Amino acid sequence: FSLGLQDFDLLRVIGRGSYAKVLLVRLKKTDRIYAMKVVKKELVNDDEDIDWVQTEKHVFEQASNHPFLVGLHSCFQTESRLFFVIEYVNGGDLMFHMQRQRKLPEEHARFYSAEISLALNYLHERGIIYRDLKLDNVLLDSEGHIKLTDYGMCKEGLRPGDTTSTFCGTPNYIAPEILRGEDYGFSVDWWALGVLMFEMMAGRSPFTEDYLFQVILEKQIRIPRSLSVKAASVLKSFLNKDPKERLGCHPQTGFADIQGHPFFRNVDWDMMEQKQVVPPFKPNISGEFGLDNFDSQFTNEPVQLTPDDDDIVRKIDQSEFEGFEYINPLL
Numbered sequence: 001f002s003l004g005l006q007d008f009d010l011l012r013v014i015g016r017g018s019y020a021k022v023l024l025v026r027l028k029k030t031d032r033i034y035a036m037k038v039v040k041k042e043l044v045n046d047d048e049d050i051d052w053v054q055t056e057k058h059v060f061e062q063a064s065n066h067p068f069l070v071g072l073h074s075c076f077q078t079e080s081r082l083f084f085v086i087e088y089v090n091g092g093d094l095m096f097h098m099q100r101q102r103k104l105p106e107e108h109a110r111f112y113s114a115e116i117s118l119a120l121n122y123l124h125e126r127g128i129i130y131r132d133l134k135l136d137n138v139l140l141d142s143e144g145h146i147k148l149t150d151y152g153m154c155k156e157g158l159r160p161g162d163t164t165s166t167f168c169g170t171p172n173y174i175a176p177e178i179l180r181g182e183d184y185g186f187s188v189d190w191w192a193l194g195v196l197m198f199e200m201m202a203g204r205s206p207f208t209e210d211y212l213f214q215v216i217l218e219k220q221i222r223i224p225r226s227l228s229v230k231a232a233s234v235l236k237s238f239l240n241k242d243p244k245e246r247l248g249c250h251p252q253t254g255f256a257d258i259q260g261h262p263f264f265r266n267v268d269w270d271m272m273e274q275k276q277v278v279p280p281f282k283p284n285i286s287g288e289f290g291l292d293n294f295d296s297q298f299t300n301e302p303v304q305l306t307p308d309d310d311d312i313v314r315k316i317d318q319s320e321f322e323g324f325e326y327i328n329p330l331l
């Protein structure tokens, strides 16, 4: 019935994180290619692990169809591993891009932040706080549009006006209200976007973790002299330390406030969401599979899954993973 590992060819290793090894794969007997995230079950032990995997799967399902999120093809498992077969996104990522470009013109940062805003707003309308926005979690597709990735840290199930309390995120991007221990909502995503926009336009972060948190909480953010009034305003508005006054966070009008901000005046949001706006940069894409923009650290790895150690695998609590199988109800 459900797909399994033996329905795919492994083509290349393309990435690694703390939970997953990511490969380019191809559905046998077809030309259809996917990314495949492989998570060893021996890494899923705590409630934090279980929730991470469950959340990633549930958000992957919500993300299918939306242009700026990564779609889910299928989930399946072997005795030792969990597998997510997902949209293959091969334009690189914004961290990669910033390492090469160093600093983006305001028009470029506008384009990326507009698409990220549309992605965030869709997640928020579905009750999801993203909580993991950072340069290397914004992928570029082959044409140069953005896709948000890495969904395990999301909070899902937030009815409008709900808040949550978990201390999490990447330190450089964690919002003041999280650092203050307040319950929070979607405001933390708009703070992170502020930080990311600062990084794009200034070429540096606006800021030990202890000292970094103190800087986030107390230090005044200075806008580079060379940025326009509109950029200064959009950055200071997103980086307001009070979530009640922050851009995008005003009740009822938040997203309209972003769309109406002078920084975004030259944005046709309807065309933007239909991918009818020309990206300002076209990623390098060559050859049969366009592996140009992945670190050779991974594309040089041998294309294989590490052999199972029976002494470990026999101890896995397989009941924890019943029902993992999934196939996209759109094929």
Ligand SMILES: Nc1ncnc2c1ncn2[C@@H]1O[C@H](COP(=O)(O)OP(=O)(O)CP(=O)(O)O)[C@@H](O)[C@H]1O
Residues within 6 Å of the ligand: 014, 015, 016, 017, 018, 019, 020, 021, 022, 035, 037, 070, 086, 087, 088, 089, 090, 149, 150, 152
């Ligand atoms: N849909 C996709 N298409 C192409 N490459 C992808 C991809 N999803 C992930 N990758 C690559 O794999 C790398 C690791 O994936 P990811 O960061 O999601 O790992 P992870 O699930 O272990 C969570 P984390 O990295 O935050 O610890 C990414 O940095 C990216 O380069």
